[PDB]
Each structure stands twice: as C-alpha cells, then as structure tokens.
Amino acid sequence: GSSGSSGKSPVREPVDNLSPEERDARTVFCMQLAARIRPRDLEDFFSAVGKVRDVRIISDRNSRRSKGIAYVEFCEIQSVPLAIGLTGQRLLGVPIIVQASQAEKNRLSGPSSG
C-alpha cells in the first residue's frame, strides 16, 4: 500500500527506465466487471491485444452506484487503443468496458499540460 510521485509526461522519452508518470500512460481503465471475476479472466482476455503485467481490481464500494472498476497495465501504450475497442465484449456473461485511463484524467486537469 503506497502511491504518489512527481514528474511530467514529455512528447518524447529517452532510453531510461519507466518514469513515475509514464507508468500511468501505459495504464487502461476497465468497468462493468462481473460479480465473480478474477484477474486472470482479464489478463488473458487482454492478451489478445497485449501482454498484461499487473491488474488492480477495485472491490471497495467507493460510490453508491454498484459498479466494478479495474486497472490493467499493458506492455505498451500503443496496445491500449485495441483494448478500448473491446468495450462491449461479453466477459463471463457480462460485457466489459474499456477506456483510456488518461482520457478521464486530461479532462480533470486544465486544458494545459498536467
């Protein structure tokens, strides 16, 4: 249990290790998960577009609305696009939602960088 960091997301990046910011970039946001779903279900399900390294599933009810949000990290950001389309793929009997985790972010912040 730990999080938090400082940095910026430049248009170009060197051959350096992942940055506290880049991490988010290569992160996808999922929703409308099943009642008895498991990390694997998503892992493999996402293995069709890219390999998954980690999957953070949220179970703790944050908002009244009974929704299940999850996060999946892809090998690259270019693989996120494909995942997004999946939006509407019957998973375990219940369709799954996929959207750019950053998209919802860029909005929160002002039109300018950040």
Region 18-114: CATH code = 3.30.70.330
Method: NMR
Residue 97: strand, helix, or coil: strand
Asked if residue 86 lies in contact with residue 95, where contact means CB atoms within 8 angstroms, the answer is: no
Asked if residue 84 lies in contact with residue 99, where contact means CB atoms within 8 angstroms, the answer is: yes
Closest alpha carbon to 95 in 3, 40, 44, 30: 30
User: Which residues are CB-neighbours of 41 under 8 A, at least 6 positions away?
Assistant: 34, 91, 92
Q: Please provide the distance, in angstroms rounded to a whole number, between the alpha carbons at the two ends of the chain.
A: 25
Which tokens is 97 given? 């939602």
